[PDB]
Amino acid sequence: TPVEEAQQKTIEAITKAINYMAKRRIGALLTIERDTGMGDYIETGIPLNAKVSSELLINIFIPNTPLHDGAVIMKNNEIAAAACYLPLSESPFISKELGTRHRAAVGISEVTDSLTIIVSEETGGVSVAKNGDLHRELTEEALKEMLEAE
Amino acid sequence: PTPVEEAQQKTIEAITKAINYMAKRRIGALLTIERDTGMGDYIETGIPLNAKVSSELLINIFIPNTPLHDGAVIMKNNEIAAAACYLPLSESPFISKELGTRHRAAVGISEVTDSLTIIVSEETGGVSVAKNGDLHRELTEEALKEMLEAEF
Numbered sequence: 001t002p003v004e005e006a007q008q009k010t011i012e013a014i015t016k017a018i019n020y021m022a023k024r025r026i027g028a029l030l031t032i033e034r035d036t037g038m039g040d041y042i043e044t045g046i047p048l049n050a051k052v053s054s055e056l057l058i059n060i061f062i063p064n065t066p067l068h069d070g071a072v073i074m075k076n077n078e079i080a081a082a083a084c085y086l087p088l089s090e091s092p093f094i095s096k097e098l099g100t101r102h103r104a105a106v107g108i109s110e111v112t113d114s115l116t117i118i119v120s121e122e123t124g125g126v127s128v129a130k131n132g133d134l135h136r137e138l139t140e141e142a143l144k145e146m147l148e149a150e
Numbered sequence: 151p152t153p154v155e156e157a158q159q160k161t162i163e164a165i166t167k168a169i170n171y172m173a174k175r176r177i178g179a180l181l182t183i184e185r186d187t188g189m190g191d192y193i194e195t196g197i198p199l200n201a202k203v204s205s206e207l208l209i210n211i212f213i214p215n216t217p218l219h220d221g222a223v224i225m226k227n228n229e230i231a232a233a234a235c236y237l238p239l240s241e242s243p244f245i246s247k248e249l250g251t252r253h254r255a256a257v258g259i260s261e262v263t264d265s266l267t268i269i270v271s272e273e274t275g276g277v278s279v280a281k282n283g284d285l286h287r288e289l290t291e292e293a294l295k296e297m298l299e300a301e302f
């Protein structure tokens with residue numbers, strides 16, 4: 001269906017952008033709003049309300065650019081805003097080598113049902129935060145399965 | 151001022167801040183503002199954004215060696231419609247011979263539309279505008295803003 005074709009197109013755009021950033025070790029933080037509304041966090045960022053493309057996602061996160069610092073938040077199959085604030089987790093059970101990008105992803109996942117993807121600037125490793133837990137060192141197939149399950 | 155007029159002012163401020171930033175850093179840029187002649191044919195050649203304008207997004211689009219930087223950004227009113235768009239190349243003899251494809255594309259679209267196109271040179275950082283087949287070079291920040299204000 002149209003709705004299903006649109007969701008798969010968005011998943012493919014996300015996975016292509018994540019793969020590009022993982023290969024180049026570009027740090028990234030991408031939160032997908034689900035049933036819990038995230039308007040309060042969207043409003044801290046730069047409004048985009050933009051169509052999803054792998055190209056725009058990549059351009060947003062290039063280091064030392066206006067939009068790279070903070071989270072992209074997606075809502076209703078669009079990029080709602082970039083450079084958004086997310087709350088930092090105080091969980092003592094996050095790997096100690098990880099920094100604020102991963103703590104921000106876990107933090108938003110503690111108070112929403114959202115799914116957040118993180119690319120590490122140190123290793124290019126891909127992880128996902130959901131329900132207060134961080135799932136680390138994901139393959140491409142694993143990330144796709146998580147997006148399709150979500 | 152009406153909401154329409156305030157929105158125009160915000161968009162002009164976003165454009166000028168982005169152009170000034172890229173000019174200082176010699177970030178090449180090609181930004182076409184649709185006016186009364188519709189540019190759908192050219193918008194459809196690019197990557198669709200349909201995004202709210204901000205100086206930050208305009209800058210991020212044109213960073214060298216990124217997916218979106220090669221080609222034109224086309225704006226419709228207060229939105230960035232698409233990036234990496236094709237524009238036709240002018241054959242006008244009044245384009246300085248040292249200028250490259252961004253400037254020839256800008257003059258080219260200006261010959262078949264009433265649009266206003268801004269170009270930042272990656273060689274010199276100079277800012278130019280193409281309108282009605284003419285290229286106006288080496289614009290001050292003040293001159294660019296006045297041209298934009300007059301276009302609206």
Ligand SMILES: Oc1ccc(-c2ccccn2)cc1
Binds near residue numbers: 025062214
């Ligand atoms: O740490 C960096 C990672 C990536 C870039 C970059 C720049 C342009 C295009 C793609 N990547 C710069 C620094």
Ligand SMILES: [Mg+2]
Binds near residue numbers: 287288
């Ligand atoms: Mg002069």
